[PDB]
C-alpha cells in the first residue's frame, strides 16, 4: 500500500494541524528500498525564523534521522544486521549512533515508546521525532516527523512531542484504512 493524490490531500491538513500544534516543521517521508533513506514527499514548515527547512525530495539518513530510524525500527533483527553490514554507519555528529548494539537498542526503545527520536544525530542542534504509517500488510509505507531546534524541542517536551507525532501518523494509517 502507498500514497496517492487523494491520500496526500488527506495527509496535508493533518500535517498543517501538527505544525500548528507542535510549533515546528513537519515532514512526511517515504522509504527508498535501498539505501533505506527516507525521502521527504510533503512538508509544512513552521513560521519561526530558525527552523528545519530541508527541501521536498531531500533524503534523511537511515540510521541517523527520526524518519530513517522510524522505518528501520519496523525491520527484524537480521534484516537490520544485514543492512548495517552493507551500508555502514556514517557519523554525522558526535551523537550519531555508529555502534550496531547502540542503534539496535534505540530501535527497540523506538518500538516500545511508539516514536523514533533523533537527538542531534543528523545535525548539531537538530531534533526530530517520528512515527511510521502502515498499510493493510503492516508494512510502513510512510513516516511523519516533527523537526526543530534543541532550543525549542527541549528534554522536558520530548515525550509530549512523541505523543503528537504518534497521533498524526495514526490519523494517516486510519485515513488510508478508510479509503482502503
145 is in an annotated binding site: yes
User: Is 152 one of the binding residues for a copy of itself (CB under 8 A)?
Assistant: yes
Among 5, 33, 49, 156, binds a copy of itself (CB under 8 A): 49
User: Is 1 one of the binding residues for a copy of itself (CB under 8 A)?
Assistant: no
Which residue lies nearer to a copy of itself by CB, 10 or 158?
A: 158
Among 16, 20, 34, 53, binds a copy of itself (CB under 8 A): 53
User: Is 13 one of the binding residues for a copy of itself (CB under 8 A)?
Assistant: no
Burial (0-12, 13-18, 19+ Cβ within 10 Å), 48: middle
Backbone φ, ψ for residue 41 (5° rounding): -110, -25
Selection from 70, 50, 61 nearest residue 95 by Cα? 61
Whether the Cβ atoms of residue 112 and residue 106 lie closer than 8 Å to each other:
no
| The residue to which cell 484504512 is assigned | 177
| The residue to which cell 512523541 is assigned | 162
Among 9, 91, 108, 150, binds a copy of itself (CB under 8 A): 150
166 Cβ contact list (under 8 Å, min separation 6): 114, 115, 131
| The residue to which cell 496517492 is assigned | 4
Which residue lies nearer to a copy of itself by CB, 33 or 47?
A: 47
User: Is 22 one of the binding residues for a copy of itself (CB under 8 A)?
Assistant: no
User: Is 124 one of the binding residues for a copy of itself (CB under 8 A)?
Assistant: yes
User: Is 122 one of the binding residues for a copy of itself (CB under 8 A)?
Assistant: yes
Backbone φ, ψ for residue 39 (5° rounding): -100, 125
Interacting residues with a copy of itself (CB under 8 A): 45, 48-54, 122-126, 147-152
**Sequence ranges of the binding site for glyoxylate:** 66-67, 118, 128, 145-147
Amino acid at each position: 500500500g502507498h500514497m496517492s493524490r487523494n491520500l496526500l490531500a488527506i495527509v496535508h491538513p493533518i500535517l498543517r494541524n501538527l505544525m500548528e500544534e507542535s510549533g515546528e516543521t513537519v515532514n512526511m517521508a517515504v522509504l527508498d528500498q535501498s539505501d533505506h533513506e527516507a525521502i521527504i514527499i510533503d512538508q509544512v514548515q513552521c513560521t519561526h525564523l530558525m527552523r528545519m527547512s530541508a527541501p521536498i525530495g531531500g533524503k534523511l539518513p537511515m540510521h541517523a534521522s527520526g524518519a530513517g530510524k522510524a522505518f528501520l525500527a519496523q525491520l527484524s533483527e537480521e534484516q537490520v544486521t544485514k543492512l548495517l553490514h552493507r551500508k555502514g554507519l556514517h557519523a554525522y555528529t558526535h551523537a550519531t549512533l555508529v555502534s550496531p548494539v547502540h542503534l539496535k537498542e534505540d530501535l527497540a526503545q523506538t518500538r516500545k515508546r511508539g516514536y523514533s527520536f533523533d537527538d542531534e544525530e543528523h545535525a548539531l542542534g537538530l531534533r526530530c521525532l517520528a512515527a511510521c504509517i502502515f498499510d493493510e500488510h503492516r508494512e510502513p509505507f510512510a513516516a511523519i516527523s516533527i523537526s526543530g531546534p534543541i532550543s525549542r524541542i527541549t528534554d522536558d517536551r520530548v515525550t509530549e512531542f512523541g505523543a503528537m507525532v504518534i497521533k498524526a501518523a495514526k490519523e494517516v494509517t486510519l485515513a488510508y484504512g478508510g479509503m482502503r
